[PDB]
Amino acid sequence: TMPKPQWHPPWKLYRVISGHLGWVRCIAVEPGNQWFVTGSADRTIKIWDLASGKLKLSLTGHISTVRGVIVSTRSPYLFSCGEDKQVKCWDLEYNKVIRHYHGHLSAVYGLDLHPTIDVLVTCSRDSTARIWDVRTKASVHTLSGHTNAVATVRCQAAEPQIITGSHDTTIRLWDLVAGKTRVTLTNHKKSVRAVVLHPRHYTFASGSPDNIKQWKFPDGSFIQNLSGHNAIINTLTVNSDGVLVSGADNGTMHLWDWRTGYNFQRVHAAVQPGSLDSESGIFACAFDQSESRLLTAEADKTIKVYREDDTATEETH
Amino acid sequence: TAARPTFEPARGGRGKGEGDLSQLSKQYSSRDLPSHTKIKYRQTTQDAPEEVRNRDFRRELEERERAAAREKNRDRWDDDVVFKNCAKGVDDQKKDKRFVNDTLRSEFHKKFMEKYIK
Amino acid sequence: NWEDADFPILCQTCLGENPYIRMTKEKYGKECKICARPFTVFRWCPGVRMRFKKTEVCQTCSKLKNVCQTCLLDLEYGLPIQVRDAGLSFKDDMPKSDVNKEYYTQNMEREISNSDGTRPVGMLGKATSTSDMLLKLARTTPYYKRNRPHICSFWVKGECKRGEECPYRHEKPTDPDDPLADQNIKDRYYGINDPVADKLLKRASTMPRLDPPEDKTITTLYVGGLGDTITETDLRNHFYQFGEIRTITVVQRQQCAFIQFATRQAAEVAAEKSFNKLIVNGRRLNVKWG
Amino acid sequence: AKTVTKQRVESHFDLELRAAVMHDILDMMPEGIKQNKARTILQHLSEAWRCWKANIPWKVPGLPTPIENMILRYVKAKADWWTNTAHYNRERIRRGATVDKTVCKKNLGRLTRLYLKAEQERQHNYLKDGPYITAEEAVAVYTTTVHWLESRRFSPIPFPPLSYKHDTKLLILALERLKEAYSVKSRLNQSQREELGLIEQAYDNPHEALSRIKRHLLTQRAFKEVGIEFMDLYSHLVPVYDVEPLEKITDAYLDQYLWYEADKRRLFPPWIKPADTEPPPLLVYKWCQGINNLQDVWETSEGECNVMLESRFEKMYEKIDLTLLNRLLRLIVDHNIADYMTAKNNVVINYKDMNHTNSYGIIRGLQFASFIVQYYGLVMDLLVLGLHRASEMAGPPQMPNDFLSFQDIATEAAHPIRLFCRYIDRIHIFFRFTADEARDLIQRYLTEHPDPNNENIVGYNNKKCWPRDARMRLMKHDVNLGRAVFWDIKNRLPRSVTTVQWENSFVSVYSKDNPNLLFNMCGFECRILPKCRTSYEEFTHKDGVWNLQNEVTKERTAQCFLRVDDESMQRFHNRVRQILMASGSTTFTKIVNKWNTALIGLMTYFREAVVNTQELLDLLVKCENKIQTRIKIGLNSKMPSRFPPVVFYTPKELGGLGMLSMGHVLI
Amino acid sequence: RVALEKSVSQKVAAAMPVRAADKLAPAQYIRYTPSQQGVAFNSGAKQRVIRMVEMQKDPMEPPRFKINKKIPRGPPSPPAPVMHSPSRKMTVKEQQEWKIPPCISNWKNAKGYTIPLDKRLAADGRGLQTVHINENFAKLAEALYI
Amino acid sequence: NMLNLLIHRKNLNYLHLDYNFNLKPVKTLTTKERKKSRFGNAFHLCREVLRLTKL
Amino acid sequence: GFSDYAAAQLRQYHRLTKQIKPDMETYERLREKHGEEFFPTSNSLLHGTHVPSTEEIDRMVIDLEKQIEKRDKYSRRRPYNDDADIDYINERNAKFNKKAERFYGKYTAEIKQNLERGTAV
RNA sequence: GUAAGAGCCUAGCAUGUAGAACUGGUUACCU
Ligand SMILES: [Zn+2]
Ligand SMILES: [Zn+2]
Ligand SMILES: [Zn+2]
């Protein structure tokens, strides 16, 4: 027993939201906890009331599967991307698309907003990321250098400003100013389909079917290796209390400590009634801004909402 | 042959904005004109980041959760005929409450196939 | 890709005899005569009766081969590229066929624009090892007959109606039955069958040079033009570089010094270093065999 | 970077699904697997989707279960995509929105495939879950039919005799009905050619054909596969069945013979309504004056209500048990004929990749399916009315009475059910209630279905075509009486046999509070308003109205106001939409001839009901301008007008298109 | 943000190439040291000063050179070491249990092969579908005959 | 001059722009020459605007 | 069975490495010549110095040619009888039918019996 | 029976270039 981990309370499901007619491929929470977005395979973006779990609005306009959705914290905007090859900007003041970001060659898989510059960074199946100016809808740079499809992207204001994992099993840490690669991290054996940034401690983790790896930001130093959750993991998300969440394509989801990397909870949730036993799967998860709800976007066309169990310690290894 | 799948996609980085803006082309579309040339920012009542920083979200979320749960709680002659009352206790049998993840067995699909095939 | 770099890379016989130059910069004016991609054309006038020379090749195609952008001669020596590669190795092998040339140009442009921007990217390490025969026929003072307006082709038909006002020369063009007349741009640039460089190599081959030790194991050096103003104590101070020096016979009457070394390799090395180069005490020391 | 617009959508979906499967199989394989084999798994995914569309169970005998589960996952994803696209496009083609002709054919081809998946499911569930008919109930149905047939002294139809003197006439009638099909067209494949060749052989040697028909009726009990396709009427789809020619000739003769021997034997009483001597507008007129000629029908002084019920037998075709059908047909005809007709309904239905067996229902596309439908409908008319009231309506067998007539005045007012017609699967009953009967029946309904919140007035559909003064008023007694009458008629039928549904039915009560009863019959709706009730201005100038006289007094008591039903208006609009499609739509005379045929169909069916409906006149003007604009775009002509209307409306002998008008156009 | 906005302006300058067509006269000076000294070169000097004026662009002049010329992608930057783990040992059993059988389709025969009939009809699901009858047909048939 | 310098740079010697801006083929064209010499709304808008001004 | 491209490498290596026989004369000659640096670490110095005499490179090339030949014999060609009722119209068709008999031959064994007995049972 | 390979034949549209490299030589001792 080299470390002793922090005690985290167990998480439990309390709400299953239903109503998409396709796989729910993305989810994001508004900065003020009033609502959350989902984007799905039925080409609709749905605004859901976060407290009551009720469908607030259904936006249409993508021609194919919506892959990523993010809400702007500085501007009153909603960015989305699809398998449409299209990257849209929704003015939430009007509930209408005002700008489309054109130039990707194949399906756009992810996007992240830069937190301080008004820059949008997207990934595609064409083995490139792109860097867009929001106001002029122009490609600033084309981050090229991956050899297979590019799965995920995260942005910062500190150094390396752009971080991406891809389906050629590597991770590239980039320079936003120059537009060239700074660090290549080849440690994973299978496709990196999730990366997540820590809110305080200036590290990041990344996930793949072999195992999940933690890393210091300036030059990608190896810090740790968190293993045991062996499936194609689609997302990673972090609570400021140091709770890592790793969800996968088999529907399983393991709850981890950030610091020591201790698996304290495994949640293998049940599918929807009509659904099929092979259709269990998670594509997206998010914490709310209170960091006490856990929103998962499932392959049985549902949203599941979890909260911490108020029945204290029954736990400790 | 002619009819074939892909097995490798096209890689971006070799055209019109990719390396030198295709060596600075003077070609531009109608969709590349100046339009929406001013970013809107969140105002003080909208959700400006100064307004979002001091807030305790868990208490407000618990209040809204409580109000929503309270709203959902407060909401809720010829006697000689060969067949008697067949529908005795059928109080409409709430099929229209169930959501079923099967597109051939949804209640929407059953209504659809009943409505559009004669 | 475009080229677009400020202030061209020029020699001193094309940049002019005036230290005050007014040049114009056109952003993507011409295409390169080699690369065929457009570059930044600089146009200046060297002197008074000159020609308004301009840069012919890219910054990149001059960084590849360490040349001036308009005379296409070495920045350091002022010689054709075939002469300098003759006095060096030739390991660049720039492609001449079409798609290979543009592909090689793209990749070398990425190579140069992924570096500092100061060194002749491949020619540097071989440019350390130098001072072959090219230094003994390097031009000392600028040849300002290069910067000179072309023959007036109306005066060739005896019909120059400008007369005294025409800024083109009224003098004979060269007889085309001459090897020194054809001279393509790419022939001057790749170092292939350049007749100027052919004549420079024919002169530098008949330059006076070492002879081998005709008889076996003889290390004897026959020094004429020794001089009676120098001392033999300085001779050993110049000569212990080579190896195990044997006896040194000195005859100051015929101004001949006789030298013996350990191996004939050391005598050949001394012949290499010494012959027609070595001037000590400001006085030429001639060494021969026999 | 080309955009995915409209012609790239399906190809791009299949381009991206295949890439997603590529990524998942690269991540699913463990560490030391040879990293080939992506192409083979993609071929298996293609095969699983083709077996999904074919409703073929897909199972590869050895295949790793992660690959099998992943292929099932992505096949379910593409299935949801295909089906939701079909829903969206069907709602567009129904509402009239702009659709391509290719997506019309694509939507038809998807919809017939989804129908056959549901139909294979239904036939399998019938063979799995037993009969629904619940043998007690089938014995009740059979015994009621036996008592009805012995009550009428019915003489059972024999086998068609060897020296039947009328059989060549029936063969000529059958062959004329078969050759009327291939008269419009001229492009015929091998099966049509065989059908016409068998028709010509049957004309050229009739007794060999009659020997063959009677031999098939005696011996053959296994039949060939029938094809199926759909007729697209843009509001719903219609099953069309394709039968082999020899079987079709045998069924055609059987159809002619059975209807002839049914008319001689007076099998169908006069409420079996698509009758030979009554066009449907004559049927509506006869129904109106039959309501008028009931004794004291409009008097509401002591408290009496007139109720009109219109509904259907919802899945009457779909739910006929073939064993019970065999039993009822052995009651009617020879056991060989009954076995032929029963075994003919048990065929294999084919559409491109799809085959299943009709084990439960009946094929509507049979030649003699008319007889099965009208006789099974007779059985359920006996279920609804009961044998006593049906024997009063039909009269004695020695002196049977015609359609809306009784033997005496005293037998009219014997029961609440006064009039009753069944047009093929739709029911029309007239009810006369005294106050006591109405109170008792509403008491029974509110006993069985209590309503403390007065919610009966919510779900009650009223007709929105007529204006506000003209519709049915919503009073509590009348609403509860209408729901109670519907409840009581609904209880009389087992749900396993057929059912009657409130959402498709309309009930109308005439009372001291309601001055009008609305009814809807063959495709025009009408309301009758009597002069003794609230009229206040005894007028006669309009042509849409009907001044219908009382027979006894020879005086006009009530008026009938006619309008075209919205379904018939929408059917005419869909017919014109069908004309504007159909790629021979540049010919300029084909278009005008189809328009003229549709327009005189509409008019000469709905003669005086057309001018009383303003929405149908506006639709006629709009459709006429549509086909004129189509001709003009055939000359391209431009947006600008003053295109001369003499080219359209000149008779076809002076070179014109011959176009008929039903709009206010001036030259 | 200051580095990004400049590249943004250089991209957006295409979107309106000529609106208030451009202006160019910041005529500048540059001091240059020939690195060739040994003087016979300037005339005897060590440096030379050059006045650069930018050549004035014709407003009415189309683009000069062909830009549509297309060449294959160059080599990528030198490969990074792959840093994997030792590698889990693979068994014959699991190597054989991840083998994929060839798809024999009922519909597609791209290279027009000829497949044996037992292989062609190896659709097991329509052989294990097992049409199984209910026992309530018996009550119905018997009651009807009685 | 502008419109027929555009014509002559495209090597379409079989077309003729007259002095009233009517574009007619000099000869009878093959399919390849006809597909090569199809212009768009830019050329024909400029040609018809110049027709109005020459009127 | 196969299981790995590295296990086959290791088997091939153990074969080749048991086959080789060292000559101690050259070994002890180089040992006495090199002395202390004959037992090098990772960072010794001698990486860029060794020049093999002609007999050494001849031995290497002969060994490598033997190894290439043994690798070329990896798939032994099964003999082609023509008494089997052929089932293919092509040369690739035959190999596809062979792969199909490998994979689905264990299952489609009743239907083969039906096809030979006259489509019966 | 097409207006396109191919494939031939003859043709004509861009350039106003960079460059010119040419000289030096002595002889001598003891047995
Ligand atoms: Zn160049
Ligand atoms: Zn120069
Ligand atoms: Zn002159």
Side-chain angles (χ1 to χ4, degrees), chain E residues 109-115 120, chain G residues 87-97:
Chain E
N109 195 3
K111 263 67 191 302
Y113 288 171
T114 296
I115 280 89
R120 179 62 56 78
Chain G
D87 209 346
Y88 52 89
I89 47 89
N90 213 171
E91 195 268 330
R92 294 183 66 86
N93 201 165
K95 290 173 71 177
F96 182 76
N97 289 321

Side-chain angles (χ1 to χ4, degrees), chain C residues 2-152:
Chain C
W2 304 109
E3 192 269 309
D4 197 1
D6 190 5
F7 186 66
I9 300 172
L10 295 173
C11 61
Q12 291 300 309
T13 188
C14 295
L15 192 50
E17 77 269 16
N18 192 359
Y20 300 100
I21 305 299
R22 303 181 304 171
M23 66 175 64
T24 66
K25 173 172 70 175
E26 188 174 3
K27 184 61 68 181
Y28 304 119
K30 303 293 189 293
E31 277 178 350
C32 179
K33 297 290 186 290
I34 299 297
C35 173
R37 295 182 195 276
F39 72 99
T40 304
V41 180
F42 296 91
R43 190 173 182 268
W44 67 95
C45 187
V48 181
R49 281 83 184 271
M50 308 300 174
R51 194 182 66 192
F52 278 102
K53 297 180 76 173
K54 65 177 74 171
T55 60
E56 301 293 326
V57 300
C58 297
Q59 290 278 111
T60 298
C61 286
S62 68
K63 288 180 181 179
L64 262 64
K65 208 165 261 75
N66 208 174
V67 293
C68 174
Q69 298 188 2
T70 175
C71 66
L72 298 174
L73 304 178
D74 193 12
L75 295 175
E76 179 61 38
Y77 297 108
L79 273 70
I81 307 167
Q82 182 182 1
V83 178
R84 183 175 66 93
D85 292 329
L88 288 179
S89 67
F90 61 98
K91 270 72 176 173
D92 54 359
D93 288 330
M94 184 174 176
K96 295 184 287 185
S97 65
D98 297 332
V99 180
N100 314 338
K101 181 176 70 177
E102 291 107 18
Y103 183 74
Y104 178 77
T105 305
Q106 177 193 3
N107 298 325
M108 289 300 291
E109 186 177 1
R110 184 179 180 271
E111 191 271 333
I112 293 171
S113 178
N114 200 359
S115 66
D116 52 356
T118 315
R119 274 78 177 271
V121 291
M123 306 304 288
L124 183 66
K126 64 189 289 185
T128 62
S129 66
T130 46
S131 178
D132 205 74
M133 52 81 205
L134 50 82
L135 194 143
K136 285 186 178 179
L137 80 166
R139 190 177 289 276
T140 60
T141 60
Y143 185 76
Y144 287 148
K145 291 167 91 287
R146 278 197 279 268
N147 320 330
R148 192 171 64 185
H150 304 95
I151 307 301
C152 180

Side-chain angles (χ1 to χ4, degrees), chain A residues 98-281:
Chain A
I98 58 165
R99 280 179 290 196
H100 72 280
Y101 294 150
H102 183 82
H104 275 289
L105 277 302
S106 184
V108 189
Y109 288 176
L111 77 169
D112 198 356
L113 280 164
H114 193 284
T116 49
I117 293 174
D118 290 326
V119 161
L120 184 66
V121 185
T122 62
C123 295
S124 174
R125 188 265 198 94
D126 65 359
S127 296
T128 58
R130 283 179 185 265
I131 295 162
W132 304 95
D133 190 7
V134 174
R135 197 258 296 165
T136 66
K137 69 178 73 67
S139 293
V140 180
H141 296 290
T142 304
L143 303 178
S144 67
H146 288 288
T147 58
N148 200 353
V150 184
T152 183
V153 62
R154 293 286 178 266
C155 296
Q156 292 193 0
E159 285 296 324
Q161 274 167 345
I162 296 167
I163 297 157
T164 186
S166 65
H167 288 98
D168 61 354
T169 71
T170 66
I171 291 170
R172 289 181 183 265
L173 271 61
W174 296 90
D175 191 3
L176 171 57
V177 177
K180 293 182 179 180
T181 313
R182 289 176 63 187
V183 183
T184 300
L185 302 168
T186 57
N187 291 107
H188 288 275
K189 293 183 179 180
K190 293 181 185 180
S191 75
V192 177
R193 203 175 286 183
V195 297
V196 70
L197 268 49
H198 196 281
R200 285 94 171 96
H201 283 167
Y202 196 65
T203 56
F204 73 105
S206 76
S208 60
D210 39 352
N211 52 7
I212 292 174
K213 300 185 188 297
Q214 288 181 355
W215 267 326
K216 278 176 92 285
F217 281 121
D219 289 327
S221 175
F222 180 67
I223 297 300
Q224 201 180 4
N225 192 1
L226 282 70
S227 66
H229 181 60
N230 44 5
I232 302 98
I233 72 102
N234 288 114
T235 46
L236 298 175
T237 188
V238 179
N239 184 0
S240 65
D241 297 331
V243 181
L244 182 64
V245 184
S246 69
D249 266 326
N250 54 359
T252 62
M253 180 183 69
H254 295 182
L255 276 295
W256 286 355
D257 191 3
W258 181 264
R259 184 177 68 87
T260 67
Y262 166 67
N263 193 5
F264 66 94
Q265 188 177 4
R266 297 183 173 182
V267 176
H268 303 175
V271 291
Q272 204 177 13
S275 176
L276 186 62
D277 291 331
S278 65
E279 201 179 0
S280 186

Side-chain angles (χ1 to χ4, degrees), chain D residues 379-499:
Chain D
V379 167
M380 294 184 296
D381 291 335
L382 294 168
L383 294 177
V384 172
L385 298 175
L387 293 171
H388 181 73
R389 187 60 171 170
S391 66
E392 289 177 353
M393 284 185 180
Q398 285 73 239
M399 192 179 290
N401 50 358
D402 53 353
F403 169 55
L404 298 180
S405 66
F406 283 97
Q407 291 291 321
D408 288 325
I409 291 97
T411 58
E412 292 188 356
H415 297 284
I417 297 172
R418 299 294 177 93
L419 308 180
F420 180 80
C421 86
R422 181 181 66 85
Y423 189 88
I424 293 170
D425 57 349
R426 296 182 177 90
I427 311 299
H428 300 278
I429 320 103
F430 190 77
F431 288 95
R432 179 70 175 173
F433 288 107
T434 66
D436 296 331
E437 293 173 353
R439 285 189 292 111
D440 193 3
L441 185 263
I442 296 167
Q443 279 175 356
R444 288 182 291 172
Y445 174 69
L446 291 174
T447 295
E448 292 291 326
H449 292 280
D451 192 3
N453 290 318
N454 299 320
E455 291 177 354
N456 288 321
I457 68 170
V458 178
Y460 190 86
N461 286 320
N462 54 0
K463 290 184 178 181
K464 269 76 67 179
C465 298
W466 298 100
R468 299 291 294 165
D469 294 333
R471 67 184 65 250
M472 177 179 173
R473 274 80 173 179
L474 295 175
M475 294 295 289
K476 186 70 178 296
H477 179 74
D478 295 335
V479 170
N480 294 318
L481 178 63
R483 287 190 180 272
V485 169
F486 185 80
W487 179 76
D488 198 1
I489 297 298
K490 186 173 181 176
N491 289 321
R492 287 176 171 179
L493 295 166
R495 289 182 179 179
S496 67
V497 181
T498 192
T499 189

